[PDB]
Ligand binder design. Structure first.
Ligand SMILES: CN[C@H](CNC(=O)N1CCC[C@@H]([C@@H](OCCNC(=O)OC)c2cccc(Cl)c2)C1)C[C@H]1CCCOC1
Ligand SMILES: *[C@@H]1O[C@H](CO)[C@@H](O)[C@H](O)[C@H]1NC(C)=O
Ligand SMILES: [Cl-]
Ligand SMILES: [Cl-]
Ligand SMILES: [Cl-]
Ligand SMILES: [Cl-]
Length: 337
């Protein structure tokens, strides 16, 4: 096999990146987030009651309208950081890119307003391992590896900075490989800690000159479904104090005028420094000293077994094109352009 497919992604405000899949015959279209921190596929169901305002406001999958659809009906409940969704399993043909696979996915029938009323996407396509898939359902990239059509057993993410230009490419997933148009130089590869989670070892996090955090090592999940960088409550407090940031209800902020001269934050990964400047981590809506600007960094206490861990989300990926490699169990980073 030597096929590599591409899916264009929409970038909504540098916090939601999502692309299209088609389910059924004829294809029903869904906006989905490709999430390396999870491993199940789901979209909203036609059987989702109106009582779920979130079901009113998203695209629904109608089993009746698809000839390839095969019933299963087994209960499914998926819990994320954002909330819980539930429904049942269905099987059908899913297209992503030029690739068609038969897949088991969740038809969601309970979808809470918090926070799905704020999702610009309809569902999630988990790119994690079967070890994390609820119901041990075979993940879509695993069903794609099976077809043997892919040039290499890897996928990769380019996430762009949101642009006013009507033309800006919001982002791009490649199945089968990486697109040299969106990264410079060569990949630096880091080995997974273990198969089952896209998580690597991290040697420290430094803010400025001083190695402030994770001084004796810690973990980093590379999470394409995460908008921000996240660390544990106790690390983030330390980081935010170092930056003179203020915690609010939904976010952390800084005086907008102060943002540009805030220190770099570096992540020490596979012997190298991955550095994010304040231009990569502050949302500079203005530079006014009477306005507060949000940082693209927050606290998330991810529970064992996968946490405690940092998570490197779009804030980080924006800068570093990311290749997720299943064949060799490793992740490669190169400078995004
Ligand atoms: C395990 N991977 C995801 C972890 N994401 C997160 O924890 N957050 C922190 C809370 C808000 C989330 C944001 O998602 C945007 C998509 N993501 C992304 O475009 O990335 C670059 C979000 C914002 C608003 C509404 C909703 Cl439902 C979600 C991001 C699991 C996510 C995957 C998507 C469903 O929710 C679970
Ligand atoms: C649906 O999923 C359960 C999980 O494998 C399985 O036992 C069952 O055979 C499948 N249901 C049907 C109706 O085929
Ligand atoms: Cl059912
Ligand atoms: Cl889950
Ligand atoms: Cl720490
Ligand atoms: Cl940013």
């Amino acid at each position: 096999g030597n096929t590599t497919s591409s899916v264009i992604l929409t970038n909504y405000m540098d916090t939601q990146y999502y692309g299209e899949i088609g389910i059924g015959t004829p294809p029903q279209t869904f906006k989905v987030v490709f999430d390396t921190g999870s491993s199940n596929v789901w979209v909203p169901s036609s059987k989702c009651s109106r009582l779920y305002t979130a079901c009113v406001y998203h695209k629904l999958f109608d089993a009746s309208d698809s000839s390839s659809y095969k019933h299963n009906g087994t209960e499914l409940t998926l819990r994320y950081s954002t909330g819980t969704v539930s429904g049942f399993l269905s099987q059908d043909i899913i297209t992503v890119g030029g690739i068609t696979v038969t897949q088991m996915f969740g038809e969601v029938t309970e979808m809470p307003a918090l926070p799905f009323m704020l999702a610009e996407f309809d569902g999630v396509v988990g790119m994690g391992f079967i070890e994390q898939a609820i119901g041990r359902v075979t993940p879509i990239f695993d069903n794609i590896i099976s077809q043997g059509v892919l040039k290499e057993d890897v996928f990769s993410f380019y996430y762009n900075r949101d642009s006013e230009n009507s033309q800006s490419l919001g982002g791009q997933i490649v199945l089968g490989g990486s697109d040299p148009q969106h990264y410079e130089g060569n990949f630096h590869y880091i080995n997974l800690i273990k198969t089952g989670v896209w998580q690597i070892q991290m040697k420290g996090v430094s803010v400025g000159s001083s190695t402030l955090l994770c001084e004796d090592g810690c973990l980093a999940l590379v999470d394409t479904g995460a908008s921000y960088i996240s660390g544990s409550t106790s690390s983030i407090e330390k980081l935010m104090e170092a930056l003179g940031a203020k915690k609010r209800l939904f976010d952390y902020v800084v005086k907008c005028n102060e943002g540009p001269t805030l220190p770099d934050i570096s992540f020490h990964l596979g012997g190298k420094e991955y550095t994010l400047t304040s231009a990569d981590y502050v949302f500079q809506e203005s530079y006014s000293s009477k306005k507060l600007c949000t940082l693209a960094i927050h606290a998330m206490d991810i529970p064992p077994p996968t946490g405690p861990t940092w998570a490197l989300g779009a804030t980080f990926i924006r800068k570093f094109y990311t290749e997720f490699d299943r064949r060799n169990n490793r992740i490669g980073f190169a400078l995004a352009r």
